[PDB]
Amino acid sequence: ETRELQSLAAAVVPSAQTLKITDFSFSDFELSDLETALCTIRMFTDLNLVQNFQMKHEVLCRWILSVKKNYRKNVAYHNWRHAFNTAQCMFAALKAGKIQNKLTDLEILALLIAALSHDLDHRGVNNSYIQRSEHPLAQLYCHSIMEHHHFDQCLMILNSPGNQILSGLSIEEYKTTLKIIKQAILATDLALYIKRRGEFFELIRKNQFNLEDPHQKELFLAMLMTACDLSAITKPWPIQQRIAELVATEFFDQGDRERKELNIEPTDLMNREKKNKIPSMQVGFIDAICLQLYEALTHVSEDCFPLLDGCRKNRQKWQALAEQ
Numbered sequence: 001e002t003r004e005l006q007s008l009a010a011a012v013v014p015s016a017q018t019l020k021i022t023d024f025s026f027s028d029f030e031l032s033d034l035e036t037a038l039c040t041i042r043m044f045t046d047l048n049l050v051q052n053f054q055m056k057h058e059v060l061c062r063w064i065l066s067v068k069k070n071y072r073k074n075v076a077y078h079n080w081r082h083a084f085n086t087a088q089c090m091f092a093a094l095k096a097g098k099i100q101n102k103l104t105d106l107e108i109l110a111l112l113i114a115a116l117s118h119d120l121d122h123r124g125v126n127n128s129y130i131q132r133s134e135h136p137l138a139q140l141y142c143h144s145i146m147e148h149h150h151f152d153q154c155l156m157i158l159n160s161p162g163n164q165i166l167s168g169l170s171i172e173e174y175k176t177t178l179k180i181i182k183q184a185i186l187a188t189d190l191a192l193y194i195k196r197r198g199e200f201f202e203l204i205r206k207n208q209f210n211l212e213d214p215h216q217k218e219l220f221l222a223m224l225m226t227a228c229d230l231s232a233i234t235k236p237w238p239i240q241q242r243i244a245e246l247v248a249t250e251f252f253d254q255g256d257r258e259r260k261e262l263n264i265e266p267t268d269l270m271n272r273e274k275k276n277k278i279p280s281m282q283v284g285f286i287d288a289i290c291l292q293l294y295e296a297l298t299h300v301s302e303d304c305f306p307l308l309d310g311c312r313k314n315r316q317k318w319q320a321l322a323e324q
């Protein structure tokens with residue numbers, strides 16, 4: 001195909017150990033785009049997906065480049081690097097967290113594709129903005145608007161000539177995998193996490209959680225998607241500090257759009273005037289959204305404790321910054 005493909009396809013794919021992708025503390029900051037593509041190949045390979053599903057090397061490389069291409073390079077946070085890191089956290093939870101022992105390769109295939117694809121064509125604004133602005137997508141979908149679009153994009157790329165990494169699946173495996181992918185991408189709508197997490201937390205608290213139950217299995221994969229999606233909140237403080245810059249940039253850029261295009265005053269979360277409140281806001285988000293999730297996940301796998309540990313340490317640093 002293109003020069004990028006040729007370079008990628010011919011490149012040696014270093015080991016997962018070399019690439020550090022099993023570390024919960026992994027950072028992509030020193031990596032070129034090409035190296036993030038090699039990391040992604042390594043993820044598919046070491047989860048046995050390439051071999052078990054008979055993926056051709058050129059097809060996987062083209063698919064990865066198609067996915068990366070369909071994230072926007074002018075969206076500060078929801079871009080290819082966020083999707084790549086989400087997939088890397090999924091790899092680490094599966095390997096270092098040993099969750100791969102409890103899932104089938106078909107489930108893992110869907111999870112990894114969904115992690116990589118779950119914010120495709122994100123435009124730097126949230127569902128509330130899409131609805132309030134009367135964006136065309138808001139006429140197509142009533143809820144989880146962007147996430148429905150992310151899945152549409154995901155399926156378009158999976159079906160593109162030369163990109164069909166699922167061609168080796170039988171029709172029944174293909175249908176099941178697409179449905180898991182769709183659920184997994186829709187799960188990254190924080191609104192759906194908030195609606196469904198109470199059931200997960202109570203099953204865990206009562207020690208009634210049963211991964212053999214298909215409903216609880218689907219619930220767990222949704223919680224795991226959220227855990228990977230939010231995982232910047234667990235990173236070592238140098239990383240977290242930098243990711244926070246991007247989140248704030250994207251939030252405040254939406255606030256500017258709401259002022260200029262919708263003539264409304266943005267909430268504090270998206271109001272650049274309130275930037276000195278980011279520490280207290282990070283603490284609020286950790287308490288409200290993050291801690292119980294990483295706490296619950298460790299009841300599923302004790303080896304996922306580094307995520308919870310990392311979350312607690314960032315809350316300590318953010319609370320110290322809030323106290324000024």
Ligand SMILES: COc1ccc(CNc2nc(N3CCC[C@H]3CO)ncc2C(=O)NCc2ncccn2)cc1Cl
Binds near residue numbers: 230232233245
């Ligand atoms: C202005 O700048 C910020 C303002 C707030 C925060 C903390 N709040 C979030 N932080 C993240 N991110 C993603 C990566 C880790 C973390 C950044 O550390 N994402 C989403 C939110 C968030 O509040 N969403 C709205 C919402 N909350 C609860 C229920 C429904 N809706 C961080 C920054 Cl930077």
Ligand SMILES: [Mg+2]
Binds near residue numbers: 189
């Ligand atoms: Mg999203």
Ligand SMILES: [Zn+2]
Binds near residue numbers: 188
């Ligand atoms: Zn995301």
